[model samples]
Target: MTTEQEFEKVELTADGGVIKTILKKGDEGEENIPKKGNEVTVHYVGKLESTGKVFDSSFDRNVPFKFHLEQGEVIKGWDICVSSMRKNEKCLVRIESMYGYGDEGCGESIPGNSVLLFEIELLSFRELEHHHHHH
Candidate 1:
């Protein structure tokens, strides 16, 4: 019998505030990595690590979430996490309170200083053309 693990874990931050485990690998290409200002679509389920309570989910709503990368659209962890991901890649992201909602967590669902776990699947992304101003 041979034991194999498909999950690959990596520390996205040196301080260990954000950790990512790849569940499914996406396309192989450097261009697949999303860049700042690009619009990215993803499906995600968020939970509280302390109790494994699901706080939010795009899967249940049957809708994919879209946001611009590194544009202060989402939480710090999410911004950092998604930036390193490729199209069609699925990952389980673990984020500490500092990288998540911090001391003031979300309403009712999450408590203060709670750690968060998110299952995020990067569906697709479109690069927004930037019009350069001639100096």
Candidate 2:
């Protein structure tokens, strides 16, 4: 649902804890929302929720990152957070360990079961035919 031209806060799950706040709603447009298997490009900055240490940032590279929404190509929380966003949507998502690196964690920058914070901006996306409207 939307309110006053803004997206309502989404409480993803009732695991008794979550943080997926939309810092700023994106531009509203017809057929702007992306679905699973759709290609999406975005810029982002990732950090530790506890220490604010930057683990990654696409902004520094001056290039956009692309991925499929909810396609298991990324972390669980990132998939959920970015999928909920619209075109040009900017957000700050706080992800629990389960939704983040989990017990396995990431590279040397991330530890096992460490919570993460990401400031992401949805730049654009392309809706694929096979993702929806089955023939």
Candidate 3:
């Protein structure tokens, strides 16, 4: 029951909690992937999957968001999406309540047990060398 078409969807979670579809294939090869803890920057349009209501949008504001990969700075689905993305990649991520706002939900924009859809564009990432040789 998805409105998008012609894109191959991939399940990020085992129980179908997170689904992704690439809108733009940016890079290929394992070397281009961002490692954990890398600072990633992205622009996204966040919407309610059920009603297709726009809740948040980086594009509208002209400001991209940044966070450390897999660092729990954002949402679980976001971490998963960044982990699977490449530089300059643009993808649509479908986040179920299990991976999103869940039962409590966010502010007034999101409701409890709601699913979210994000159109995210990976702008770039900085590889942070946190594990320096100290010995």
TM-score of each: 0.70, 0.69, 0.71
Q: Candidate 2: which stretches are off by over 4 Å?
A: 1-10, 13-18, 54-66, 131-135
Q: Candidate 2: lDDT over CA atoms?
A: 0.65
Query: What is the lDDT for 117 in model 3?
Result: 81
Local accuracy of candidate 3 as per-residue lDDT tens digits, 26-99: 65755677656777777666678787786754444465445566666556677677776788677788767767
lDDT of each: 0.68, 0.65, 0.68
What TM-score would candidate 2 get against the native? Answer: 0.69
The best-first sequence of candidates by TM-score reads: 3, 1, 2
Instruction: Write the residue-wise lDDT of candidate 2 on 3-86 in tens digits.
Output: 555545456644333567667766676787765577887666667877767665545445545566766656666676666678
Q: What TM-score would you give candidate 3 relative to the actual structure?
A: 0.71
Error of 2 at 10 (Å): 4.2
Q: How far is candidate 3 from the true structure (C-alpha RMSD, Å)?
A: 4.5
Collision count of model 1: 0
lDDT of 3 at 49: 78
| Global lDDT of model 3 | 0.68
Worst 10 residues of 1 by lDDT: 103-112
The candidate with the higher TM-score, 2 or 3, is 3
